[PDB]
Symmetry: D2
Subunit: 444 residues, 4 copies
């Protein structure tokens, strides 16, 4: 009778390996774990009649370490190719191919249907941008500059410098309450400097309001006309239909060479992995081969486990819920602000992040804006970013005026809040309740 039992799991598994797409409904844990166990025993470190006389054998001293990784020890890839099948680890190599294939499937469902290729890379989004820039150097050996429409996030700014290039900060234009791409200045800069001296244009979709996603269609056309590479920082934009649509359109009407996303921000897994994806299949393969040596299999295993358990239906559900929570948070901030003579900034073009003003707090008199930020933290509100006026800040030599606000002089101090994937109404209701108590105390 030990037949028809397996035969239902074997089929969900054979179906996964042949067509490479997410299951529509999530696997039961019993299936997932049977599968992980079937892969792990395919690696040579887990063979029964095995001897190892090499210096890298996947030996594990602690049993707590081996059990928590489902006995996957050899990482992904070979030394010369992170995407190559590892003969010492047939099972881990298969894992890598399936995970990458699932991630590709989700990029499509999420919005970029024309994606040609992608891979999971066990560094975060900053360092994966850096690996993009490091790959471009070889192609454009005269190139010295990366043109970068400003965003006050220390990681993607430093990514250009760790790669050893010079970022050219293109300030944004203030349209209403929104901060947007200065397409005039960007094109003036590629001409002042010269296409040959530009490594790439580096744009951002996901960001804190009142910045909004960059004008990707326009920027991609500039890039196609001047023969300049386009790199998109899409850090948490997989969860946003609008963001994924910009990338999609930017590639249709113009040029996008790669776009980069975080794993934790989009798939709800621990920090430390990212996806590099693109439309030229061979260029994405090239970034892959620029990675020296083997890498951790952890972020891949986390992603594989998460997508198989959720299914594409579980994803669609979370994505729909995120949109709904954005409306509900938006309306709640509208209601709460009004009571304090503040307003929700008009930022329609930003689908994930919102801002509430703080004009009624005097920072130079009572240091109230900072104080608000501090109080929110000690009331265990997380992610509530306060942004004061006129903060100078130096990051890797370069000085920012009005830092955290994405421009030298925004009209007012404000407070961020987001609806990111996984949010529950309790988050918003507790946020609103705690912000209310906080403002009340500051203004008393």
């Amino acid at each position: 009778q030990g037949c028809e039992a397996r035969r239902s799991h074997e089929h969900l598994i054979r179906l996964l390996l042949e067509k490479g797409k997410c299951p529509e409904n999530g696997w039961d844990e019993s299936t997932l774990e049977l599968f992980l166990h079937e892969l792990a025993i395919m690696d040579s470190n887990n063979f029964l009649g095995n001897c190892g006389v090499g210096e890298r054998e996947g030996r594990v001293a602690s049993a707590l370490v081996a059990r928590r990784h489902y006995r996957f020890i050899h990482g992904i890839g070979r030394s010369g190719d992170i995407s190559a099948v590892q003969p010492k680890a047939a099972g881990s190599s298969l894992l890598n191919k399936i995970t990458n294939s699932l991630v590709l499937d989700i990029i499509k469902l999420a919005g970029v249907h024309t994606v040609a290729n992608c891979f999971v890379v066990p560094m975060a989004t900053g360092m994966s941008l850096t690996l993009c820039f490091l790959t471009l150097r070889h192609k454009r050996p005269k190139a010295k500059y990366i043109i970068w429409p400003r965003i006050d996030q220390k990681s993607c700014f430093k990514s250009m410098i760790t790669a050893g290039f010079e970022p050219v900060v293109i300030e944004n234009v203030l349209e209403g309450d929104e901060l947007r791409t200065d397409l005039k200045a960007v094109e003036a800069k590629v001409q002042e400097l010269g296409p040959d001296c530009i490594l790439c244009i580096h744009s951002t979709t996901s960001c804190f309001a009142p910045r909004v996603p960059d004008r990707l269609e326009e920027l991609a056309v500039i890039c196609a006309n001047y023969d300049i590479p386009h790199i998109v920082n899409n850090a948490y934009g997989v969860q946003s239909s609008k963001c994924m649509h910009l990338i999609q359109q930017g590639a249709r009407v113009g040029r996008i060479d790669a776009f980069v996303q975080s794993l934790d921000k989009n798939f709800m897994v621990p920090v430390g992995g990212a996806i590099i994806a693109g439309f030229n299949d061979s260029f994405i393969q090239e970034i892959s081969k620029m990675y020296p040596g083997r890498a951790s299999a952890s972020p891949s295993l986390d992603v594989l486990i998460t997508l198989l358990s959720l299914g594409s239906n579980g994803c669609k559900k979370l994505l729909k819920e995120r949109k709904e929570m954005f409306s509900y948070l938006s309306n709640q901030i509208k209601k709460l602000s009004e009571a304090y003579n503040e307003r929700l900034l008009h930022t329609p073009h930003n689908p994930i992040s919102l801002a509430m003003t703080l004009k009624t707090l005097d920072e130079h008199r009572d240091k109230a804006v900072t104080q608000l930020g501090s109080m929110l933290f000690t009331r265990q509100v997380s992610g509530a970013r306060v942004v004061p006026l006129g903060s100078m800040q130096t990051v890797s030599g370069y000085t920012f005026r009005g830092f955290m606000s994405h421009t030298n002089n925004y009209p007012c101090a404000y407070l961020n809040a987001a609806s990111a994937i996984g949010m529950k109404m309790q988050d918003v209701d507790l946020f609103i309740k705690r912000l209310d108590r906080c403002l009340k105390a500051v203004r008393k």
Copy 2:
């Protein structure tokens, strides 16, 4: 009575946090897990009265993912500093400090007593060398070349190219059976090229016989005299008293700016992490700050769990056992080779790796050397590297003659075998038994 119970564990824990060294004897699992649980609940994602309105909150969709990481989700560091305390994750930040502090303790016990500083970085050894080279670019903006005494390992070679420099391959000199540093050629090259055009000298300790660790004392003096940075690839050399001693001596008599080690090869944990360590405390801090964004906490958690369970006594034990297994493997290969009219190459200066000759196999007639390698693999011998004559190979544009042998014309084909940490007699006895059967079949 819920007092004196905790009070024995609390003390092992308070002792760990105050003096920062390994326990001498390993903790019981009950203590380790109590500690991990005490840290995890210190992170805000695990707070009970928590709401999150940000885009990175450490949300975990699958319970299998959260439980297997002991609920550590936020990774290590902040965006501007991978070594900074994370206010959203006080517990993960503490983990990072303890792990780094334990690793420092083990570097000392293992041999480099004068180490000033180190950190765990969740990329492998190749990419961590790259992060070293990326840090040096800023200091030596005229520098274009890395001088590199040859070793046929695709990862550390590519590391120089991914960083965007040009490796200058310095061939080795054949002394007896051993391949060693050409100190003549290295110093001739820094003069032909010019100190200002050298980014660093890149040397290797651990490697496959018949190469041997590089002459670090001499190379460090060359580096101190010409004001050139010295980077040591010490990939699996923590386990070797002799290797760690070279690094130690090289820093005493000369200059070493950083040395890099793998986690899996030395601490028996999954692939995907490395340690960057050095003698100038501020320079090591600088490599740290060149890493853009946050990173995975996984390889650190693996290391913390492994060292607390083993203790420094468990390490000393494994290190002693490795030496003994090297003798036993050495003697066994001596015995087996003799029976086939082969010999164990005289490579006294290499403490981890051995080689047996294969002169009695005709590769151009019967393709026997390749065939041997193939048969060893299908008999589930792992790490048994076969090295034929005259294999050409291209790696990132650069062509290698006699690849895998570290020089253009080694006298013979040979077979590697190692005694790396964690080896058991069964490995050697099964290796010998299976190699014997293999040679017999090839020569019949």
Copy 3:
């Protein structure tokens, strides 16, 4: 710092103070923190420990030790399964707490007047046995147990294992329901004599068309003749109607203990039970009658489950069981219409339903026997098929009309039930495959 560990301690300190279920379930982090701190209270988990005894709690396999959260010593002392074990302070605390939580749930479920109870790691059958074994010393001339019939081999055999002779009282057909023959019960105590009766042994939960025994009338019979009353409540914790029935019987008459399965009511593995009652002293006597130490595994399962669910967690599950019962009923009604069958009118049973199989031929086509075999291979579990004229021998006693709880029920029938944790998918998949099963069995 550790101003964050405090709110975890609050939930734990509140559980130890009053010993009631939390209204909202604990997060896993809190639970596992609590469990890991109970386990280091046990002497076998002490750091400075040497053991020169024969029961030291040594564990050979790490897999085994980890899966029990390092609880090895079981519950109890060898002389009292309800005593603190000095060598296992943590496991003793675990056992006190589990019993306290389980007491709260019995009250919450409908028996608010329950005085005491304990978890025992045998199943319901063998716990009923422990009740009888305890009654033997109080009634040493007793030989008989009066038992309103129910065709279930475990409660029946529990009387023979204890060493008494079960006196089977057939049921009365009252409409479509099978109910307690109260007159034949009372006649049996008059014929055999009260002193010769160990107890009356009745049953709340059961398969339709049997319904809960009339506990009030039996509790009064037992009060008058001075006979103890033991109620088999195997899976009636999930039914407020069964629990209120037990509460009412205790109010107007006499109920000495009532026994419940852990796995049918709390959704944990098979193996443990609850013995409860209204007389603090007698429930203590059944506990003290247990020889030796016992597994802590079913306590730890219940404790993890209640702390994870909470009051509200439990209330919700109990409310949805009702809704699934209506839904399963309407669905059986509708499906039965289309096959010229009907839903037996058994309104007194709140858990189990029955549907007629008159139109299926069992003596010429053997379709009734085959409908069972069919529902199985289509992976329907728990849908039991009851034929006509099934003779069966359990422990020497031979039943006519087995599975039907009487010798000649009017028709063959099919059971289905709404047991706690049932989802709308369970009903819908069942209706579907039954429909394909009947349709296919008419060819």
Copy 4:
């Protein structure tokens, strides 16, 4: 490909073929692969499943489900704890295999002629009870159980729970050892009469200075008078001398069953036991006497442990228990010398030792009572201290000289033991803290 999964299948296919322990332990990867494939054979783990029953194996907490490897249905059918459960094919297989492995170990340990045995998830006390309960139906006029005294509350109470009256036979002081009063046993069967005796109930393993009962002489007494013989072998599987003693008694006389703890012999959590015997039919009858389904938890613990250890794993543990026994002995000898005490000469006991405490005053300084309390706070477990004149009441019967197994042993004494899994550290830490304990108690 999957030419690597094959060698795992080989180990599993070999276990199912012959059902013996592997000589070398399985790797965890093999074990967990085996267990995860047994668990998907259970209907509650089927993918296309709907459940309309009242026992469907629903699990509310993921923590609970995972820690039992998704085994929820327990072992057995409600009518036979030794039957295949169609709703749980995997758990039935788990149960067959565990029993087969455990049979192999009984043989390996010294009773090569054992015919049958089964794991039962009650402890040794309540399993002894199940034996008596099974004998009641075969001997319905019996009232008494003849019992060579041993001061341990669980085996003593097991006779009263079953409903029989224990007839205590005091022991003979033979040297320093307490042994079976064979003449007083035989006189008691002649006074009460064989037909009134349910069985003789003897004991192999015990605390020094009691030693294993004379099973051969009692097995012959039982053969002649036609009385059943039940042996309490609670922790004697680990002693080849106890097992050979049981093997010899069966050879020359009559032994009906012998009972063993799982936790004392196999280093798993408290809770389960083995009932074994030489008559295939009678061991089957004790199994069939169990009402209902039972926990699978202690089976799964034993199965994980034996497959991890193997034959050799077990042999080694048993060999080291001997070596620790010599070592503990020499160490007690040496330490006792320095305190003007001695090691009671009890050569017939292979597990437990005793050391005199003559020089400690218990009636003027109360040092004997206090040495116990002291060894505890210094975290010595299992070192039990036996005073003089300890009166005690268990279940109405009052013992004089409790813990000493007679009314007037010559002196107070202290027990220590070499039980399986003991390490040289255990002895050395004990010798040390005893030495600091005595030294401190003379002031």
